[PDB]
């Protein structure tokens, strides 16, 4: 028997088999199943993922809330109900890992770069759980923010390399009024830190406009903006091609930055068109 | 989609071709059965095919791919037997409707990039000296499952450790396929079917009955306990000219981090000249 599913309401499932059976039943009814993976503590950046999913005609939206051990609940659910989301998938760690940590996904060597410097197993955790959610839910499209750009690229590698049939959709970063990318970590910044933190996005938009004068100009403009900020310890500032290989001499790229303010690590990135 | 002719063998090399045919067949009600192979087909493989065929309304996909990722060496990949003409002929005789024969480039356009890391079972038994072998196997099997999206996938008990690892892949990644293990098909004297038996000369083929003889002796000895079962098998292997044993191990049925209770699996690997042969059997201890 298919688990209970009430159309137009928020249906919450905590068992992977339940959400798997309801998703498969809905697919058979002529719905397109959209998956929005999250770790809860939802903010407007997560809601942009939800809204992008909802606009696909025929969509049913599944939002998973799972804190990976390997990479309020009531508040989150209320936010999803207010968005018209019909399915939330809220499994326990033991439901996700009933045999513990066993077969995992090994990322390619991109996972050791950039964010993988301080956290060399983070992406193996992310890709393992993303793979599992994709198999449980079997969505037609899966939605991820561009803010975690290296994650997004590695996800696309997973999908290509394991021949997954899902479409991966990147959704542009949602930003505070001064450009700071949204994050639950922003609230930990004191006022001097929060003022300094706008240097990340300001550096990146300066670089994207400087880029008519070429790659070096784009990088030097971003470095000058970051150098104008106090208490911003830059971990990296890298211009790469769109798939995070070496930047080509012109054309399309991506500029990524990460920095520590006090004990809080912030990331941002932007599209760059060289010349 | 490309062309699909029922009651005929349709051969697709392009992953996208077999994926589109598979999805179209599933959409019309047929259940899709996958039998992954490395070619060089013998009656062991045909038993998997026959098991697949008997599932009602099934369409059978047999894949043939010598997977370079599960080979290290040392020339093992180049030496693997390739008999493509006979393979497709056998499949036509068995009434299989789909053969999937992808190229290396189609499977690995980016080389080795994201891969499957098996659990600790992969570092034991066959994996002890070949620590990357089962990562190769699981990577290729995951890709085939995603390409074909079968309802059921068929593997031999012959390669028992592989089968157990594929059940772990399926469970651990929440794959929506059922894994069917098919019992080992044997020559009249007991020798397990294998695409390596072709490398046994007459003397080695005669000597090689010792593996199956040892294992069935142990299974019967096992009414007297584990030591009795192991010592019976060791005796038979010891009496065999030119069999060099690499391991003889009695484990729990899942080969995992748990001791033997009542039900076990006894596994052997041995070398006859340069030919390495495997076999295994169910063991029931005592009562
Ligand atoms: C910032 C931000 N913008 N968006 C679309 C997203 S999705 C997300 C997330 O952590 O999933 C963060 C953000
Ligand atoms: C403000 C702001 N900061 N960043 C990194 C970007 S990207 C962007 C945009 O319109 O693409 C606006 C902004
Ligand atoms: C003959 C023979 N050798 N072996 C290992 C086995 S397992 C078996 C069986 O019928 O279950 C028969 C045989």
Q: How far apart are CA B171 and CA B254, in angstroms?
A: 13
Q: Is the Cβ pair B15, A157 closer than 8 Å?
A: no
Give the closest residue to B54 by CA, choosing from B31, B71, B72, B73: B31
A107 touches chain B (CB under 8 A): yes
Paired tokens of A45: 């950046």
Rounded distance between C-alpha atoms, residue A255 and residue B167, angstroms: 42
Quote the ligand 3 centre to B282 CA distance (angstroms). 9
Record: contact B138-A103, CB cut-off 8 A: yes
Q: Coil, strand or helix: which one is B114?
A: coil
Does the annotation list A148 as a binding residue?
yes
Q: Is B233 helix (H, G, I), strand (E, B) or coil?
A: helix
Which H/E stretch holds residue B231?
A: helix B226-238
Q: How far apart are CA B72 and CA B137, in angstroms?
A: 12
> Encoding tokens for residue B205?
């083929």
Q: What is the DSSP string of chain A?
A: -PPP--TTS-EEE-SHHHHHHHHHHHHHTT-EEEEEEE-SS--HHHHHHHHHHHTSTTEEEEEEE---S---HHHHHHHHHHTT--EEE---HHHH-TT-S-SEEE--GGGGSGGGTT-TTHHHHHHHHHHHHHHHH--SEEEEESSSHHHHHHHHHHHHHTT--PEEEEEPPPB-TTSPBP-GGGGGS-HHHHHHTHHHHHHHHHHHHHGGG-HHHHHHHHHHHHHTSTT-EEEEEEEE-TTSSBPPSSEEEEEEEEEEETTEEEEEEEEEEE-
Q: Does A227 touch chain B (CB under 8 A)?
A: no
Helix axes A122-137, A149-161, angle to 10 degrees: 60
Quick check: B147 contacting A, CB < 8 Å?
yes
Structure tokens at A149: 């750009």
Q: Which element (helix H / strand E) includes B162?
A: helix B160-172
The CATH number of domain A173-275, selected from 3.50.80.10, 3.40.190.10, 3.30.1300.10, 3.10.129.10: 3.30.1300.10
Experimental method: X-ray
Residue A116 is encoded by which pair of tokens?
């993988």
Q: Tell me the CA end-to-end span of chain B in Å, nearest whole number.
A: 56
Q: Tell me if A103 and B110 make a contact (CB, 8 A cut-off).
A: no
User: Can you identify the CATH homologous superfamily of domain B1-183?
Assistant: HUPs (3.40.50.620)
CATH class, B184-287 region: alpha beta
Ligand 1 pocket, residue A52 CB under 6 Å: no
- Under 8 Å CB pairs connecting chains A and B tally to 70
The domain limits of chain A are 1-172, 173-275
d(CA A206, CA B237): 75
User: Is the beta carbon of A204 within 6 A of some atom in ligand 2?
Assistant: yes
The answer to whether A237 and A226 have CB atoms below 8 angstroms apart is yes
**Is A174 close to ligand 1, i.e. is its CB under 6 Å away?**
yes
Distance CA B148, CA B161 (A): 23
Q: Does domain A1-172 have CATH number 3.40.50.620?
A: yes
Quote the Cα angle for A22-A26-A31, to 5°.
150
Computed on alpha carbons and rounded to an integer, the radius of gyration of chain B in Å comes to: 19
Measure the CA–CA gap between B235 and B231, rounded to whole angstroms: 6
Neighbours of A104 (CB within 10 A): 20
How far is the C-alpha of B79 from the C-alpha of B76, rounded, in Å? Answer: 5
């Amino acid at each position: 028997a298919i688990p209970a599913f009430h159309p137009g309401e928020l249906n919450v499932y905590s068992a992977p088999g339940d959400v798997a059976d309801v998703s498969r039943a809905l697919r058979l009814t002529g719905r397109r199943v959209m998956l929005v993976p999250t770790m809860g503590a939802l903010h407007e950046g997560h809601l942009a993922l939800v809204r992008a999913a909802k606009r696909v005609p025929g969509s049913v939206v599944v939002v998973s809330i799972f804190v990976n051990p390997m990479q309020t609940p009531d508040d989150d659910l209320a936010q999803l109900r207010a968005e018209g989301v019909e399915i939330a998938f809220t499994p326990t760690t033991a439901a996700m890992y009933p045999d513990g940590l066993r077969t995992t996904v090994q990322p390619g060597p991109l996972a050791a770069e950039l964010e993988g410097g301080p956290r060399p197993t983070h992406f193996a955790g992310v890709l393992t759980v993303v793979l599992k959610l994709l198999q449980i839910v079997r969505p037609d499209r899966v939605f991820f923010g561009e803010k975690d750009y290296q994650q997004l690229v590695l996800i696309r590698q997973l999908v290509a390399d394991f021949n997954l049939d899902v479409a991966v959709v990147g959704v542009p970063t949602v930003r505070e009024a001064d450009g700071l990318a949204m994050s639950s970590r922003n609230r930990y910044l004191d006022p001097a830190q929060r003022a300094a933190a706008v240097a990340l996005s300001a550096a990146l938009t300066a670089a994207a406009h400087a880029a008519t004068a070429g790659a070096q100009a784009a990088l030097d403009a971003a470095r000058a903006v970051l150098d104008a900020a106090p208490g911003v310890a830059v971990d990296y500032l890298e211009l790469r091609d769109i798939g995070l290989g070496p930047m080509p001499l012109n054309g399309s790229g991506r500029l990524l930055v990460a920095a520590r303010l006090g004990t809080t690590r912030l990331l941002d990135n932007i599209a760059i068109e060289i010349g």
